[PDB]
Paper text:
Aconitase superfamily members catalyze the homologous isomerization of specific substrates by sequential dehydration and hydration and contain a [4Fe-4S] cluster. However, monomeric and heterodimeric types of function unknown aconitase X (AcnX) have recently been characterized as a cis-3-hydroxy-L-proline dehydratase (AcnXType-I) and mevalonate 5-phosphate dehydratase (AcnXType-II), respectively. We herein elucidated the crystal structures of AcnXType-I from Agrobacterium tumefaciens (AtAcnX) and AcnXType-II from Thermococcus kodakarensis (TkAcnX) without a ligand and in complex with substrates. AtAcnX and TkAcnX contained the [2Fe-2S] and [3Fe-4S] clusters, respectively, conforming to UV and EPR spectroscopy analyses.
To elucidate its evolutionary history, the S449C/C510V mutant of AtAcnX was newly designed. As this mutant corresponds to AcnXType-I with the same binding sites for the [Fe-S] cluster as AcnXType-II, the [4Fe-4S] cluster may ligate to Cys273, (the introduced) Cys449, and Cys508. The overall structure was very similar to that of the wild type in the apo-form, with an r.m.s.d. value of 0.3 Å for 558 Cα atoms. Glu292 (but not Cys449) directly ligated to the Fe1 atom, whereas Cys273 and Cys508 ligated to the Fe2 atom similar to the wild-type enzyme, by which the [2Fe-2S] cluster was closely rotated to Glu292 by an angle of ~27°. The “complete” lack of the fourth ligand position left a vacant coordination site for the Fe1 atom, which differed from the apo-form of the wild-type enzyme.
Author numbering: 12 to 569
Write the structure that this text describes.
Amino acid sequence: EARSILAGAAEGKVIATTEALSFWGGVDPATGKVIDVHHPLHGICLTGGVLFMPTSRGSCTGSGVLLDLILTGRAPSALVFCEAEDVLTLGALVAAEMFDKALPVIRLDTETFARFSRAAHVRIDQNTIKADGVSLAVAPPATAHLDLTDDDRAMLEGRDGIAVRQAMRIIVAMAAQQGASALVDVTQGHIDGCIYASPANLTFAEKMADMGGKVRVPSTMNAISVDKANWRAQGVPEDFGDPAARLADAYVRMGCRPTFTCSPYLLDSAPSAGESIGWAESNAVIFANTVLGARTAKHPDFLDLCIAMTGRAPLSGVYLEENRRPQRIVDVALPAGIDDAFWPLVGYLAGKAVPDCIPLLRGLGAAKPSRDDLKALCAAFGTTSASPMLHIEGATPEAGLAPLETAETVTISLEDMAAGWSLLNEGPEEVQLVAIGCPHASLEECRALAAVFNGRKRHADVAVIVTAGQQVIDAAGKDGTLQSLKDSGVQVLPDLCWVSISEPVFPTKTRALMTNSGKYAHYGPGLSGRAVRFGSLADCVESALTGRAVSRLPVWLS
Ligand code: FES
Ligand code: NA
């Protein structure tokens, strides 16, 4: 079978892979080249080709990256998946709805996906897809068999303005390709497209704001690409900082709260269990479903604003209880003597083992991970998987849900962990930067960082930078944690995250960095061009003191 998701026609090289790719962090919008150093397609330029991959993974920001690639002509000619997909499909949907450029997206059956992937040339139209001259019928897009309340139809008819109508059109089209049957109310939103990942990110926000866009539910804002109050004094180039600040300005104007944080679940406004929200940012989505028991799909950038403007989201995916049941079982080895570095590594490896469905992690309940531990795990899980949630037996409030009767069992062994640890430590021992706070550090994290520092001060050659939300930095000033960190030579930066940081705030002298973030360990090398080392919090501080990160497997892997 061949299903048309978004109509259109294309032709070019078959660029095929069996592993999902995040377009934000994995594809350079300036060149169209794969920059994920851990992906098989690394170094390949995707422009003009027909990309064959099972689905997407990682960042909600891939929609803005694809939209920019479409606007500059550097995009692939088309996208072929073999499973459900939202992020790239939404990006191509925004391109057709608001920007003229039709990129075709087709979902295949698995075996015709494997057959067509080993091909050399592929062509598409509204009718057919050819793999060297093996024409196959493409079934038309799925009919929207959706409920629309009277207020839904009224918004869709333009009774709340053109911006609200354009939001509803995108939501209804996304609901149609997701096979939904209705929309669902959301109580709050979290906008992720406020990162300046590409010029198109700003173009979309200004176009929605100039059409009258305003959010209907309380909506927070994710990390942005400037220290909003200080980027001019920091020497950030005007060519970058001005549109980056204007992008954040556009969403504040549309009524979003200027929280500028990728850990909104740490704010006083965090949702509770059973609450239906509309969140983007993959780590926050995963944390909201996994840890808090709230409900939100992993909404791509741009769709988050649409949901916030309407207060409505497609009733599909993990909004429904049946779709929250574990879809695969993962038996994780529990070695003795685990520290904080265990949890991001497990999340990273769990996503590689379960990249396309919801896992239940077994064998870890007695370990009692902190909220920060689960925070690091969910963030790392997001980088290697597409799923919006996971379960941890004996840790997360919904882990008792009956696994689906299709659920298979896989393992994460000690050998799996040693390979992953080495995978994330492809760098030297000399480091000039310690990167903490991806996602944004909690107050407990900043206090734990100061406790490990024990009043010492960093090596002069090693910068130590912590990214956190403004509200955490405000609280760290009250209880004295901030001054203690600055006593040790640590810089605490608001608004920015390591995903969005750039020179010169990212010190240009840096050749290698160490981080305690599994997420940034994966994305860091391609985003920064530097070598990246991964370790525990104390491994980071020791690197900060000595200038050096000892190349070694951890205590619990020896
Ligand atoms: S912006 Fe995604 S984790 Fe900080
Ligand atoms: Na991600």
